[PDB]
Design a protein around this ligand. Sequence first.
Ligand SMILES: CCCCCCCCCCCCCCCCCC(=O)OC[C@H](COP(=O)([O-])OCC[N+](C)(C)C)OC(=O)CCCCCCCCCCCCCCCCC
Ligand SMILES: CCCCCCCCCCCCCCCCCC(=O)OC[C@H](COP(=O)(O)OCCN)OC(=O)CCCCCCCCCCCCCCCCC
Ligand SMILES: CCCCCCCCCCCCCCCCCC(=O)OC[C@H](COP(=O)(O)OCCN)OC(=O)CCCCCCCCCCCCCCCCC
Ligand SMILES: CCCCCCCCCCCCCCCCCC(=O)OC[C@H](COP(=O)(O)OCCN)OC(=O)CCCCCCCCCCCCCCCCC
Ligand SMILES: CCCCCCCCCCCCCCCCCC(=O)OC[C@H](COP(=O)(O)OCCN)OC(=O)CCCCCCCCCCCCCCCCC
Ligand code: SF4
Ligand code: SF4
Ligand code: SF4
Lengths: 115, 175, 215, 156, 80, 176, 318, 97, 70
Amino acid sequence: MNLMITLLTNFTLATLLVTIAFWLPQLNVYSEKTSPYECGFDPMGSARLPFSMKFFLVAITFLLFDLEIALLLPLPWASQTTNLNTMLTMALLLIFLLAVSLAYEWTQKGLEWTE
Amino acid sequence: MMTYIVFILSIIFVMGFVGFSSKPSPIYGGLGLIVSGGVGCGIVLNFGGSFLGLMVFLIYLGGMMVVFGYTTAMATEQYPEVWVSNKVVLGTFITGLLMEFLMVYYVLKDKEVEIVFKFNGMGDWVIYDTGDSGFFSEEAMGIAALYSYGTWLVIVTGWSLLIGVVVIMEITRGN
Amino acid sequence: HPAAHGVLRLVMELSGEMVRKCDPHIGLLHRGTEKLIEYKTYLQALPYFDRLDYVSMMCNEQAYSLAVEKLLNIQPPPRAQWIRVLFGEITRLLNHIMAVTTHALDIGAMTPFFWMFEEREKMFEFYERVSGARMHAAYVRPGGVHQDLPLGLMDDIYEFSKNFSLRIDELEEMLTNNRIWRNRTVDIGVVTAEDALNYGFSGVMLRGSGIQWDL
Amino acid sequence: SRGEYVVAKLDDLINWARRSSLWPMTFGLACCAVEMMHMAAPRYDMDRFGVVFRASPRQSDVMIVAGTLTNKMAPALRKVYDQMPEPRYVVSMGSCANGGGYYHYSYSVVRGCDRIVPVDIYVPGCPPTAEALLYGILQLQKKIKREKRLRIWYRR
Amino acid sequence: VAAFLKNVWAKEPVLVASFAIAGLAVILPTLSPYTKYSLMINRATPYNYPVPLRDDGNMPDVPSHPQDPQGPSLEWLKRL
Amino acid sequence: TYKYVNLREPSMDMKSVTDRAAQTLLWTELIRGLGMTLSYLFREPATINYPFEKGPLSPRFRGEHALRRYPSGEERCIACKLCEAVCPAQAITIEAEPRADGSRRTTRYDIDMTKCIYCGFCQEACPVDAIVEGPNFEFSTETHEELLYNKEKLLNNGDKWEAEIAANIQADYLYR
Amino acid sequence: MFMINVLTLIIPILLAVAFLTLVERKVLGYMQFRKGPNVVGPYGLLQPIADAIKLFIKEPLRPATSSISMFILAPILALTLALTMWIPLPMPYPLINMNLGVLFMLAMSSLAVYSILWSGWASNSKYALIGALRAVAQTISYEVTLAIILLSVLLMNGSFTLSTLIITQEQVWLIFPAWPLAMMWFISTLAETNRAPFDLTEGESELVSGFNVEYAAGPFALFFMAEYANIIMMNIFTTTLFLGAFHNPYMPELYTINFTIKSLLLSITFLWIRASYPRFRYDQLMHLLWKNFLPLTLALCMWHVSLPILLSSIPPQT
Amino acid sequence: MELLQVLKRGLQQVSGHGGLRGYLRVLFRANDVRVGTLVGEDKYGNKYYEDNKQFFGRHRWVIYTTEMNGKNTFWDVDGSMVPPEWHRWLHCMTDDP
Amino acid sequence: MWFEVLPGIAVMGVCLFIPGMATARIHRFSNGGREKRVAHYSYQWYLMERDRRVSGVNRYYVSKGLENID
Ligand SMILES: CCCCCCCCCCCCCCCCCC(=O)OC[C@H](COP(=O)([O-])OCC[N+](C)(C)C)OC(=O)CCCCCCCCCCCCCCCCC
Ligand SMILES: CCCCCCCCCCCCCCCCCC(=O)OC[C@H](COP(=O)(O)OCCN)OC(=O)CCCCCCCCCCCCCCCCC
Ligand SMILES: CCCCCCCCCCCCCCCCCC(=O)OC[C@H](COP(=O)(O)OCCN)OC(=O)CCCCCCCCCCCCCCCCC
Ligand SMILES: CCCCCCCCCCCCCCCCCC(=O)OC[C@H](COP(=O)(O)OCCN)OC(=O)CCCCCCCCCCCCCCCCC
Ligand SMILES: CCCCCCCCCCCCCCCCCC(=O)OC[C@H](COP(=O)(O)OCCN)OC(=O)CCCCCCCCCCCCCCCCC
Ligand code: SF4
Ligand code: SF4
Ligand code: SF4
């Protein structure tokens, strides 16, 4: 009950600070002020062109790694189980496999940027 | 009408699914999937699974951010379509919303619907349990039992993730 | 742009972020100096050299005065020569403070800028005491210097040169040993000796490449 | 009338807020920019008066034309001034930005920045010193203080 | 192997520190005698109700009252 | 006559390698930079309180131009046109004619302050110490044409700043 | 009544953000051998008021080539997420006592990146696109190491609840047994908020202003207060994590004063770091966390998961 | 110790400006409350103070008047309001007032 | 000097002192002079509901002691 009230309060306080910033002052709009800013000269091409990325491999590695460490997040609660040797072995195995994957990425020049 | 809070959140869920499944442009598809993930984590948090909702919210936010970086990099157009720049996209979005609200109106009238299964019309608050759970939440102990019990699951998942890393290395090589 | 030195138009073809081609378009500060120099006398064209390198004023003054004195077959008195050399070294301190502090500012270290601009202000005070203007002195002229030093200037220069060593020590403690400063400068812009000689490089560009050459 | 007093006090408040929070743009061309940085030096300390440089024209208040405005540069300066949001002020400093200075009769020099952009304060010198530029900034603040926007709006 | 260790400690000390911490964390729990203390501490925590048993007539190991001397006590946990 | 900057070879022994590894893992020189900033936090700032605290200057300072007078009321200039012939930016315009008592005096004396570069060629080429470069520098205007000084403005500036110009000339006349 | 509580939570943090602008300018000036603003009022106390009134009476300048809906939604989302993520912090009693507050703050810190990303993409400019992609690179550099650091440091607490973190540090501080994790966490919080030396998005050297180069006054102030509220919340979060103060249930003002001065010292340390270091390259930051921080984080995670089992010191979950 | 000596110097700086009212006046007008020897006063009301213990550039200052040539200059002080005979001394061009 | 950064910082201190203690004061006002009870697990919520039902005023902080029984 309280969380949506706090969310709505913060959303209302944020969204009221732009309609105050819009409708209050004196505005003067012409077709030279609102041009895209490229340090005084008009740009070449558009900003919607393909922006060729370099760290795509590390992006995919992060895609795997985010959830592959999200598997490791219930490890506090897993310390409360009666069977402790098996839990310790499995957690150490999981982080060891993480380290092996990271070392395989490192050795095969996978962390370096293309071009 | 506060007793139908999960039903309203599910309505926003299907609304976001209609919004990004019409495929206008992957930026706004990512925005729609972020909204859908938020209301879905709200739904499962209302059912009591706060950890699972927070985890799926974090995972899908990270995935959608990497996706947005990819579409800015690679899958882009001179004039992206927001929702109304294309006739087919706007049309299918309109019929998706219309079908969703038609189903809402039909299930809110006689409290029963037949789409291939059979569904009621009362709020889901009826199907809750009336007893307490002690000094633990069941979902937390259930996911914490992954290491004490699920050794085979942990082994095959770790091997699958390591093999996936090797596969990502091998595919994007070029020679 | 805060990065460009005032006026400079790099048209840069980038492969996302890595540069593939750089095209420096210049001429935004072309004033057409060396035609108006032809349209004026030698003394009238002497203040033109104060504004070419607007952080190395008396160095350009000394260059123009040496050229005119070579054409005139005359030489300045020894005291004028010693004054010119001392103020040229003061000017070199000015230019090197400007270069290092601005370079660290574009790299990201904005604090040595404020640390060394106080010493820059003190040298500008020396300029103003010796000529009357803070930057464009018009002090060094063909035949020597225009005016003699006001009394008590040597002691002020001595005190400033006494404390400037500690100022340089503070700057070198800040920037030289820093790892983040090294990561932006260890393997950036490597120029070989032959490519530096064939490209008309002079000064530090040669001396950073191991070529022993000073004029 | 009470409404006249109310609009006068509101005009005083907005003029105080606009004059005590001047945000110039990092925009220099020549020698006079070196003197502007010496005004930004610890001795004169423009940030005492709320004057802080901002790189983008969209988040800037004033523009200080410091240097020689040549023929190849004037459209860029005009576009940069156009992109600044209202209210906008221009301070012309140095002889080059006032009337051409040394290069008045040159073929590729605009004879003053008044020909391109409207100018509020003219600061003379070659270079005008950091003390003189700070004096010009304070004079611009005084000019902003005696503005009469809401009073004229009530009269109109 | 001393030369290799010195070279890798001079070049990349972070990997050496990580591998040493990993090696200690792997080989240390099998050497310490306090793991069984964790085992019975985790087993001695009463999450659920101790549901009683029906007295058939021959149960000498379980008590009739919690304050009876028979039963699993935790004076070791109080001592530790 | 030359020194080998940045050619020192690092050491190899175990104590120095351990020191370098400790500096790597514990960030010693970053703490050194933090300590230098903390030292600069506790110094006296060099900021003067303008406009109540003006910066130091010199008697040779070049600022606003002025026209002097003899100590009897007569203006010093005799229209010799040396200043407009030596002005590099051609900021000085002089027109002269014989006045009522037959004295060679100016009729138009215009200095364009937006053309002037403030280098003191006119004040040093003047044979009768008529034109001077006064010490004033706080004379910024709000309009372009106000920086176009005629003879009346220069004479008023001379009458306004004579009490300082005479002292500055008395201080600095022996170096010329 | 809860309205009173939420407004007394959200108004003093806006005042704190404005006076943080003042303190930042004045302290950064004093570390650079000069003075800060002191002419607006008595010792410059009225400078943030002048800045705030000035920025809200200027033109908004919505561009023509920019998608207006996302252009408006992004700063609103930034300020909103900066507001409704201060809640689970215990001061010493949190406004919202979440059972999983740590994961909540992690998720809403992951969500605040999208405001920067959509600000860069919405305003049709190349510099904004460069800033947005640099934000993406910073996020993939820091996020996984940040999460593993939090998981390894929460193995001694017992659970993800932020309220029980005071009880964990009732005897000794948590910086004594986890100081390498504390240093790595401090660097992660520096790189999370795009603060120096890992600014890389509002880069005034490589770019003009970055993602907010097309945002004029009014919407531009929203990003500023979002960033400054973010750095205060990171300072308070680090203080709660590693510098747990003595809490008396009869006198909460003791804990309030203690963590207030500790968070003030942490913000002073942030500005101390800001004035003294050159800017990292955004490919060197990528190889910083993924090659130096990550292996040590994995080793310390294994050490901290094998340590309490080794010592019969597994913390309770209740 | 030296902290209470600093407090005594601050209280003496408070008392040396004619009390609390003069202290707040000079604080809100000049943003500097250090006392000094009254070197001089011109015919327009400006007061000129000197304190040679301060470092160079801060050893001479001026408190401007509140009335100059018919204008209320209580707040809008100007750097060109100094007469030339005091402009020689204020800009450190000579050692003699 | 440097100590002039101490006024504004002090204001920041007030700006970091106001909210949190206010919550405590709010927690001392609604809950009848005691702390606001926490419910992390369902047993605590069940005890809260039992107290709310047994108070008779529909307020869980109205504590009924041993004088209620015979
Ligand atoms: C919260 C509490 C306060 C925290 C500190 C806050 C104040 C101090 C802030 C300082 C300024 C920081 C500015 C940003 C710096 C960014 C750069 C950076 O951090 O780079 C990290 C650098 C990265 O190194 P690098 O960038 O130089 O990379 C080197 C790369 N090679 C080698 C290829 C050349 O260092 C680390 O990653 C170290 C992390 C912490 C290590 C802690 C080790 C603890 C001890 C372990 C055991 C050691 C003994 C051996 C085993 C024994 C077993 C029993
Ligand atoms: C069994 C122990 C536990 C093992 C599992 C848990 C591991 C936890 C830590 C995970 C680390 C993940 C990343 C590992 C990467 C290793 C491969 C690699 O990248 O090597 C490169 C490096 C040389 O650097 P370079 O080639 O220049 O790298 C390119 C950019 N720097 O190459 C090197 O620097 C050499 C690296 C290999 C040798 C390390 C020796 C460490 C010795 C420590 C003390 C003794 C420990 C005894 C335990 C067994 C160790 C094998
Ligand atoms: C178009 C663009 C978007 C425009 C709109 C933007 C709106 C704001 C977006 C930012 C905020 C997103 C929030 C997403 C859900 C977060 C859930 C959360 O914070 O949960 C915290 C807490 C979990 O703790 P728990 O363990 O359940 O404790 C119970 C025992 N006391 O939970 C609790 O303690 C339970 C409190 C009540 C929960 C009710 C059910 C969830 C309500 C969800 C509201 C809608 C969220 C929409 C998100 C959209 C994201 C794009
Ligand atoms: C019917 C009656 C009511 C009618 C409606 C009006 C209500 C009040 C409106 C606001 C106040 C109006 C008056 C504003 C000041 C007018 C006088 C003035 O300009 O004083 C100048 C003086 C500084 O003088 P200066 O020229 O700078 O001196 C040089 C220094 N050597 O300046 C100073 O000494 C400082 C001036 C401070 C002004 C007040 C503080 C700022 C405003 C605070 C309230 C509004 C904002 C609240 C917070 C918003 C979010 C941040
Ligand atoms: C959590 C804590 C947050 C704290 C935030 C605020 C911090 C600073 C507090 C105030 C400090 C002192 C400020 C003094 C401002 C200048 C006052 C002044 O001198 O104004 C003079 C001006 C012109 O008056 P004039 O007619 O020229 O006077 C004739 C003189 N012979 O006359 C005017 O300008 C008109 C009168 C203006 C009065 C303004 C008073 C200060 C207002 C500050 C706004 C916030 C107030 C507190 C809000 C929270 C508490 C309720
Ligand atoms: S006015 Fe003089 S100092 Fe300024 S830019 Fe022109 S030549 Fe340089
Ligand atoms: S100072 Fe130089 S430029 Fe100015 S009027 Fe005199 S001679 Fe001409
Ligand atoms: S040089 Fe002197 S005397 Fe000759 S015209 Fe010029 S001002 Fe007059």
